Amino acid sequence: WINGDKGYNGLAEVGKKFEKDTGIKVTVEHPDKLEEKFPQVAATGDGPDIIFWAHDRFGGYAQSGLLAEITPDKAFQDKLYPFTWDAVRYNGKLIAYPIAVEALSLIYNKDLLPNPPKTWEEIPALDKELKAKGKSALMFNLQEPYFTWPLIAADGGYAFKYENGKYDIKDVGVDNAGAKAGLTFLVDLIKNKHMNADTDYSIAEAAFNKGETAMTINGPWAWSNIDTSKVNYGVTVLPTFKGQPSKPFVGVLSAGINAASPNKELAKEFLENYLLTDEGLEAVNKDKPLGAVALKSYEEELAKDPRIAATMENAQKGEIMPNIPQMSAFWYAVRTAVINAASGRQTVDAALAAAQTNAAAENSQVTVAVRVRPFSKREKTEKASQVVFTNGEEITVEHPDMKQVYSFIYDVSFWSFDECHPGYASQTTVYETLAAPLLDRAFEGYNTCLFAYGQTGSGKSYTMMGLNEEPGIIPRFCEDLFAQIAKKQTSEVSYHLEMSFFEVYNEKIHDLLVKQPLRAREHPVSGPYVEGLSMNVVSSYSDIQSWLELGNKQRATAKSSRSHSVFTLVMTQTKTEHDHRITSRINLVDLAGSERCSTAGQRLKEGVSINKSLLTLGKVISALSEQANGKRVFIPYRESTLTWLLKESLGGNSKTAMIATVSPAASNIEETLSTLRYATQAR
Ligand SMILES: Nc1ncnc2c1ncn2[C@@H]1O[C@H](COP(=O)(O)OP(=O)(O)O)[C@@H](O)[C@H]1O
Structure with missing residues (x-):
């Protein structure tokens, strides 16, 4: 089971070659709310042997005891970027294989802006210029932390302190200086009218794809629509803030094996030795592009395309999106933080102090x-x-x-x-x-x-x-x-x-x-x-x-x-x-x-x-x-x-x-x- 938005028949091709080498036929399907049905059906000891989805929802299935403990040796682990393995780790067990990797990047209009800024601090100045010329430096979705967080995390904000392959549920980085500085500087762009607080995704996308603004922040999903827009664009590293890189949350498309499957050994053989290879990922990518990939060898091929390169540069400088249940509480705490500080109806400190305590709140059962x-x-x-x-x-x-x-x-x-x-x-x-x-x-x-x-x-x-x-x-x-x-x-x-x-x-x-x-x-x-x-x-x-x-x-x-x-x-x-x-x-x-x-x-x-x-x-x-x-x-x-x-x-x-x-x-x-x-x- 992989998604419809992905490259199915390419993956089938790798299975069509798995049968050749083994004799065992391949199970590639892309059904329904597959993610929503998988835990429904895996719970009763059914579903597919292998499921392909982002690590978001994998942290849950794992908690539900639904994924098997995978067992690749270090040799194999070394073939994929070390940070990707943190995505597929739950309760200190390896529970999926990282496949693809996804992250916000800086997107810019080469025509308006041949040399995009290295640095957040630049943007006000950059903007003052473009506005005089009837354009705007930057528009992106300021409504949701997924998008704003990168800047907020730059100087030291963080969601949950991750150490020994453990997220300290109690250690939250929303109150701290690093986060204040990011939000403050963000809010200032707004205050100084370099961005509008009301700017959401469609406004931002519309603006960038029409040639109205020089820059936006989006992820590879957004590329296609620009392609169709015929806008001359480039995708690159996010700007530094206080000389520190922006930290976007990383989304790892990852492949887990059902705890219920009797093919655990055969699955492993398939993913490790067939799918996760230059040939095997090219098969899939050729059908429907994986974006940046976890497999070092093939990413290096892909990173020839500097757009992909940049998804990778930014994913690596970023932070693996925690797959824990508390992330929700975090997302909503910070959303509210940003809304209110962007509004001006509430100071950064008070916004983020409020958000810390909502994001860190126990929420013990009754x-x-x-x-x-x-x-x-x-x-x-x-x-x-x-x-x-x-x-x-x-x-x-x-x-x-x-x-x-x-x-x-x-x-x-x-x-x-x-x-x-x-x-x-x-x-x-x-x-x-x-x-x-x-x-x-x-x-x-x-x-x-x-x-x-x-x-x-x-x-x-x-x-x-x-x-x-x-x-x-x-x-x-x-x-x-x-x-x-x-x-x-x-x-x-x-x-x-x-x-x-x-x-x-x-x-x-x-x-x-x-x-x-x-x-x-x-x-x-x-x-x-x-x-x-x-x-x-x-x-x-x-x-x-x-x-x-x-x-x-x-x-x-x-x-x-x-x-x-x-x-x-x-x-x-x-x-x-x-x-x-x-x-x-x-x-x-x-x-x-x-x-x-x-x-x-x-x-x-x-x-x-x-x-x-x-x-x-x-x-x-x-x-x-x-x-x-x-x-x-x-x-x-x-x-x-x-x-x-x-x-x-x-x-x-x-x-x-x-x-x-x-x-x-x-x-x-x-x-x-x-x-x-x-x-x-x-x-
Ligand atoms: N768990 C119990 N074990 C023994 N007797 C009880 C218990 N609960 C109530 N009673 C008896 O019933 C009487 C009324 O109890 P009460 O708690 O006032 O009910 P309510 O407070 O809802 O009116 C008490 O004086 C006691 O004699």
């Missing part, structure tokens, strides 16, 4: 727990029957009709149904398993949320607060916390806790530690905050308990809870003249009874607003989960007050968790299924 409580007094009186069960991980709902069985897996399932059961879940168990780690995250400097989700009676309060005979999460957490402060607090580090306790009622904010509506506002770095919310210093749990008593006295009636209570602990961790502060927000949120209890006043507005608010929470949480698995999505924080307020404590580097409580009873099976399905929403 932890979902479930707890099934014992039969309530009321349910026993109702002669209630069990409809909820455990099996191993799985919580299973078996409808009385016995046709309907719904099952669910959460990160953890707390089975507190029968105080007996060899896996019964006590209060301590619930704490140690779900919340303790949050406290460890809080101490590491991460913001955290614990949401408590369920219908009235399902055990939210029991779980969160508890009773003197049986203390729930909040009390244990605080006493864990304070005992750890005691431990940790030293002449090196100091701990300070403040506490706010508010509620979201009908999307309004009410402070429970004093009912007037407080206004939400937003800081552009530190995010949403409540204007006029009390922050009471705390020193022990007893302090908090006072406060949570005062607060809960003023929360919500029916006795159902009809607001979302937000218990918050801001903890400042001051070390020392030279003394930083590390801030963790800890939000413990008792959500409102999920009952969609809709029958026959302002009690209704509540219901409406609770359903709406909880739906939005779920949406964002769901978005979070998807985000955490690396896919670009929109997170509707702003769509609900609770979610907007906790924005900075939800995503980013934050640690979010939810405990859904349910009733084991047949009476409640529908709300139980609402809850459990909700909690799945959250993966």
Whole structure:
């Protein structure tokens, strides 16, 4: 499997010669969303033996365990440029053969510009000239980092520090000086009207191919269209910046072998000894040009064409495009950086500082727990029957009709149904398993949320607060916390806790530690905050308990809870003249009874607003989960007050968790299924 845009029958020719030498016939096909279908089909132990695609999507298949560990000897590795092998490396395993190589180059109008500039610094001057003569120095696509990054990386920007065939996921080069200088100089071109911020791909292409501008930046795909344009063009090295080369992301067309294929040995023989040779690549190139190639020997032939030469010069000076899931997060962080600094609505420093922290953001998954409580007094009186069960991980709902069985897996399932059961879940168990780690995250400097989700009676309060005979999460957490402060607090580090306790009622904010509506506002770095919310210093749990008593006295009636209570602990961790502060927000949120209890006043507005608010929470949480698995999505924080307020404590580097409580009873099976399905929403 190779692409349709490539040279298929040329590759078939190399297979048509493989049969001759071996006797084994060749499999060359170019089907469909081949890249999108390959993981669909390779996942079930099918697909082709060999797949040809760019290394972009190869990093994923590898993670999915889909490609085999290739095993060329050094002798063979030495035949291709050493940098190309970094493309086809995942989790420190060689997982494909580099084939072709692709990179942005400087493209210029020989007629307008016989001697193109070596140097970015030249362009303003160059431009001033061409504009006086009714033309322009340079137009390229300023909309997307793929194109802008090269200049940005020149003085030292980088996406993820790559060392031991490892990308330090945590080491990002978007904030740094090298990146500031590139973006700054870029932005200046714009400021000084040497380029337009609105310039995208088509404008740029149109302009260059019509003879309106002297220069553009594009990749070999763009050549053909110039050819048709009859514009007299040259393709060359990108300009230096601060005497350092521009660093475009390199795209390596690479050939991997299916982990499923039994032809692993035969495939290797084919790629190494047939395809990857002067003859073998010429066969393909002749059909449809490979651009620059990884095979040193043949590239040297190809680089006779100085356009190709230059794709190579620039690929080598560039950086292999990371095939990791975090690249997305990077792409979008930097896109937004550049858009806003080019706009002038935001300084370079602030743009890139914002982008660093989005590109470097953990995006940890949301932890979902479930707890099934014992039969309530009321349910026993109702002669209630069990409809909820455990099996191993799985919580299973078996409808009385016995046709309907719904099952669910959460990160953890707390089975507190029968105080007996060899896996019964006590209060301590619930704490140690779900919340303790949050406290460890809080101490590491991460913001955290614990949401408590369920219908009235399902055990939210029991779980969160508890009773003197049986203390729930909040009390244990605080006493864990304070005992750890005691431990940790030293002449090196100091701990300070403040506490706010508010509620979201009908999307309004009410402070429970004093009912007037407080206004939400937003800081552009530190995010949403409540204007006029009390922050009471705390020193022990007893302090908090006072406060949570005062607060809960003023929360919500029916006795159902009809607001979302937000218990918050801001903890400042001051070390020392030279003394930083590390801030963790800890939000413990008792959500409102999920009952969609809709029958026959302002009690209704509540219901409406609770359903709406909880739906939005779920949406964002769901978005979070998807985000955490690396896919670009929109997170509707702003769509609900609770979610907007906790924005900075939800995503980013934050640690979010939810405990859904349910009733084991047949009476409640529908709300139980609402809850459990909700909690799945959250993966
Ligand atoms: N996991 C549990 N194990 C034993 N009893 C529970 C459990 N959860 C709730 N209960 C019992 O049910 C009562 C009501 O619990 P509660 O958490 O207030 O539900 P909600 O907070 O949603 O109203 C508690 O006082 C307790 O006796």
